[PDB]
Amino acid sequence: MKVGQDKVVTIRYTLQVEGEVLDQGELSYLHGHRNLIPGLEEALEGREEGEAFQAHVPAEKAYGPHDPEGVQVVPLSAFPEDAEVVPGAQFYAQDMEGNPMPLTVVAVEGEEVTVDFNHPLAGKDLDFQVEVVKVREATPEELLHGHAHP
Amino acid sequence: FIFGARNKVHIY
Ligand SMILES: [Cl-]
Ligand SMILES: [Cl-]
Ligand code: NA
C-alpha cells in the first residue's frame, strides 16, 4: 500500500541539521492532517511500504524562516539572578500580556542582552533518513479524531 | 517589538 491521504503510516527516521543528529525514533501518524511538518509529509506522499529514502526539507516547509524581528535586546536585569546568562542559554519568557515567548541568549554586552525569540530551527534546512515501516487504512475512529491511535 | 522589548518581557 502507498502512503497517501488518510493512511496510517509508521516510519523510522533520523533527523540531522547541518550534519548533526538532533533526533531519531519511530512513530505512526495519520497522513494528510498536518500531524508532521509539511515538507516531511510531502516527501512521504506516494512512498511504498518498505521504502527507504532521504529527504532534504527546506526551512520554509519545516519550522519556517528566521524572522529578523525575533532578535531583540533586553536588559540583563530582567533575567533571574540565579541563572547563567551566556550565549546559547535558553529561557522561558512571556510578554506583558502573558503570551509565551521563550528565547535563546545570543550575546551579552554589559547590561544589555541580545536574545532571539525564533524557534531554534527557524531558518534551518532539515535532513531526514526515513524508512516506511508500515502503511494501513485508518479506522473510522482514527479518521474522526484525525490522528493515529496510540 | 521595535522599542518595546526592554520593557515588555518577563523572563522565568
Ligand atoms: Cl514533524
Ligand atoms: Cl548585546
Ligand atoms: Na497524524
d(CA A8, CA A45) in angstroms, rounded, equals 12
Other CB atoms within 10 Å distance of the CB of residue A30? 21
Strand order in the sheet with A90-91: A71-75, A112-116, A103-109, A90-91
User: Within a 10 A sphere around the Cβ of A112, how many other Cβ atoms?
Assistant: 12
List the Cα angle A62/A70/A111 in 5-degree steps: 140
DSSP for A93-134, written as a single string: EEETT--B--EEEEEEETTEEEEE-S-TTTT--EEEEEEEEE
The answer to whether A26 and A61 have CB atoms below 8 angstroms apart is no
- Tell how far the Cα of A97 is from the centroid of ligand 2, in angstroms: 25
CA-based nearest residue to A27, from A15, A40, A51, A10: A10
Compute how many other C-beta atoms are within 10 angstroms of the C-beta atom of residue A92.
11
SS3 content of chain A, % helix, strand, coil (to 5): 15, 45, 40
Residue B3 contacts A where some CB pair is shorter than 8 Å: no
Q: How far is the CA of A124 from the centre of ligand 1 (A)?
A: 14
Helices within A3-145 (DSSP H only): 38-44, 140-145
Resolution in A: 1.6
Domain spans in chain A, listed from the N-terminal domain onward: 1-150
- For A72, phi then psi, to 5°, come to -140, 155
- The CATH number, out of the four listed (2.40.50.100, 3.10.50.40, 3.30.1280.10, 1.20.120.160), of the domain defined by the range A1-150: 3.10.50.40
Which experimental technique did the depositors report for determining this structure? X-ray
Q: Give the three cell numbers for residue A20.
A: 548533526
